[PDB]
Design a binder for this molecule. Structure first.
Ligand SMILES: Cc1cc2nc3c(=O)[nH]c(=O)nc-3n(C[C@H](O)[C@H](O)[C@H](O)COP(=O)(O)OP(=O)(O)OC[C@H]3O[C@@H](n4cnc5c(N)ncnc54)[C@H](O)[C@@H]3O)c2cc1C
Ligand SMILES: O=C(O)c1cc(Oc2ccc(C(F)(F)F)cc2Cl)ccc1[N+](=O)[O-]
Length: 464
């Protein structure tokens, strides 16, 4: 008669519920979602022409053990036939670009100065092994990048990269929290390079991904297919999914059970897995849990406006994954993904070139703090100018989608590890039957969030 309530029906909540429900002697699971739909930021639109437009992740990187674990999840859900891979025999898999100095420049692979870098990067990697080692417990991605790789690398590479992964500022982000490997490598070995030159699930799908060397994958009906298959598996196992039911309050009681307070009803839980945003959870917590709520409230998230653009009979200047825009080149336009290069089967019919412009940065952030009106037009125009200037697409978009995603990518700023440590210390010291999960904590990628929900599920199962 043990009940586990999962807050939030994003990919984290979905995965947590999925792993709970699949245990041999599973508890009653209730998944509680505030909105009308499940899947969180993972969301796909089927446009009029049958094209697919992604409102969240444009596709998934099968990188490392977590990449592999996600492909396993996909196999378990029987989504094999829907999988669209980008195989190592194409440039979408082999071409990242930076827009710097009125031009696209290919980023290096391995193998001579490469514009916009004045010297060949070999010389920077060299002085990298020689670089001492940060003695501070935490350090910003910028400070870390500069110190070990040089100002150009810091300003063109890590600036852009933080924008591509976190839609965020390398001058504010923690190297320790945002790029753990880079940080451990430097900490343990005395150089990023050495620590990496010095060091997994299995299934047919994984094996293929390795064999064909996938740089990423997606689903035919769009990524939302993943959250959708998960939900479908949940209800078919009697898991109880509540949609349209914000959680309004959390409190403990006699027998250390949780009362989960909805709008106009309540649930009793022996355990709660919180897969909602840290700052939301924060506001849900009972006055006794104030120190945990403080730690949670210190975790914030940037917004990102996603603009999907389709042109009929247009073509790109180059072929690649997409291109990133450094902040010194534009504070509002983070980068553009070349959807048709990776996933031409999603171009609809008549087929038309598709790109996705990610807007955000301090442009969007200063605007949110302004009295300015954040209209569809404002975003449409920004994305179009960028498409026109950075890709030479002076044609009018034949289709356009605009979505302003409020507070959608948690930012792991300096001290973030300590907020996590405090939360965990409090949770364990007071034996709260509460488990944190999701993008707010130990990684924002979908792969990370899935894993985060699995770990949550696993640890709650270990307390019957
Ligand atoms: C545009 C953009 C592009 C991205 N691209 C990629 C990429 O390609 N690759 C990649 O790996 N990752 C990508 N991501 C990041 C990744 O998609 C997210 O970090 C991840 O999906 C977040 O999942 P989550 O479960 O942790 O949170 P969420 O998806 O935000 O889910 C949390 C859910 O909890 C719900 N909730 C809130 N309050 C309550 C309440 N009180 N009661 C019940 N429910 C509540 C919310 O409605 C929400 O649905 C991208 C993100 C953005 C937005
Ligand atoms: O590598 C990337 O993540 C990359 C992302 C791009 O677009 C984004 C996708 C998602 C986000 C996100 F998730 F941070 F919002 C930002 C950007 Cl700029 C464009 C280009 C690239 N790239 O490597 O050439």
């Amino acid at each position: 008669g043990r009940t586990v309530v999962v807050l939030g029906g994003g990919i984290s909540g979905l995965a947590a519920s999925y792993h709970l429900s699949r245990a041999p002697c599973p508890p009653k699971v209730v998944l509680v979602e505030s909105s009308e739909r499940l899947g969180g930021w993972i969301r796909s639109v089927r446009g009029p022409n049958g094209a697919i437009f992604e409102l969240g992740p444009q596709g998934i990187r099968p990188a490392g053990a977590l990449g592999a674990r996600t492909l396993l999840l996909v196999s378990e859900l029987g989504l094999d036939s829907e999988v669209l891979p980008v195989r190592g025999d194409h440039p979408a898999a082999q071409n990242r670009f930076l827009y710097v100095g009125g031009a696209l420049h290919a980023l290096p692979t391995g193998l001579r100065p490469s514009p916009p870098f004045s010297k060949p990067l070999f010389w920077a990697g060299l002085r990298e092994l020689t670089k001492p080692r940060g003695k501070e417990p935490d350090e910003t991605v910028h400070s870390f990048a500069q110190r070990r790789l040089g100002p150009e690398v810091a300003s063109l590479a890590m600036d852009s990269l933080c924008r591509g992964v976190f839609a965020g500022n390398s001058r504010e982000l923690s190297i320790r929290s945002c790029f753990p490997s880079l940080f451990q490598a430097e900490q343990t070995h005395r150089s990023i390079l050495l620590g990496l030159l010095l060091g997994q699930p299995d299934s047919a799908l994984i094996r293929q991904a390795l064999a064909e060397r996938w740089s990423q994958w997606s689903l035919r009906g769009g990524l939302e297919m993943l959250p959708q298959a998960l939900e479908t598996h949940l209800t078919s196992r009697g898991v109880s999914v509540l949609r349209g039911q914000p959680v309004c309050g959390l409190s403990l009681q006699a027998e250390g059970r949780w009362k989960v307070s909805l709008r106009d009803s309540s649930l009793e839980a022996d355990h709660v897995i919180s897969a909602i945003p840290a700052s939301v959870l924060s506001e849900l917590l009972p006055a006794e849990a104030a120190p945990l709520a403080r730690a949670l409230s210190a975790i914030t998230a940037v917004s990102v406006a996603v603009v999907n653009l389709q042109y009929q009979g247009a073509h790109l200047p180059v072929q690649g994954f997409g291109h990133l825009v450094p902040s010194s080149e534009d504070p509002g336009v983070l980068g553009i993904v070349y959807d048709s290069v990776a996933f031409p089967e999603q171009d609809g019919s008549p087929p038309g070139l598709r790109v996705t412009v990610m807007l955000g940065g301090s442009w969007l952030q200063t605007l949110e703090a302004s009295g300015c009106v954040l209209s569809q037009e404002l975003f449409q125009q920004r994305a179009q100018e960028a498409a026109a200037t950075q890709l030479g697409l002076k044609e009018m978009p034949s289709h356009c989608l605009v979505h302003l995603h409020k507070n959608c990518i948690p930012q792991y700023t300096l001290g973030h590890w300590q907020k996590l440590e405090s939360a965990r210390q409090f949770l364990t010291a007071h034996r709260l039957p509460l488990t944190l999960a999701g993008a707010s904590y130990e990684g924002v990628a979908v792969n990370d969030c899935i894993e985060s929900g699995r770990q949550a599920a696993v640890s709650v199962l270990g307390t019957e």
